[PDB]
Design a protein around this ligand. Structure first.
Ligand SMILES: NS(=O)(=O)c1cc2c(cc1Cl)N[C@H]([C@H]1C[C@H]3C=C[C@@H]1C3)NS2(=O)=O
Lengths: 49, 10, 49
């Protein structure tokens, strides 16, 4: 979501607005973007290093 | 209630 | 799965057949299970060792 505006932008936002179809990207599964769109099972796992 | 099945493993 | 029967002998056979509701267990997300049950997103990471 946008800072101070809470409007969805980005690769998440493109899938929100119908333009994008699938996002096969280094994109972290997050609770807040789980709310808007679907996720698959994770394909890579990693931590903050 | 709901049924919460498990397997016995430490 | 059983040979010639497909009836699961174990926790998920209790989960598929209306007996059990939720299965919170060390249950491996493999393709055979997820095509006929649902999984949530994983909660622990591991492997063959
Ligand atoms: N090492 S890694 O992060 O590239 C990585 C990450 C993952 C792998 C395999 C590898 Cl090699 N498989 C798992 C799979 C096992 C079950 C849980 C999620 C899928 C189905 N997904 S994962 O946890 O996202």
């Amino acid at each position: 979501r946008d800072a101070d505006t809470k409007i969805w932008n980005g690769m998440v936002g493109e899938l929100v607005y119908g333009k994008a179809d699938i996002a096969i990207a280094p994109l972290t599964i997050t609770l807040v973007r789980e709310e808007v769109i679907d996720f698959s099972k994770p394909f890579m796992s990693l931590g903050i290093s | 209630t709901v049924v919460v099945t498990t397997i016995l493993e430490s």
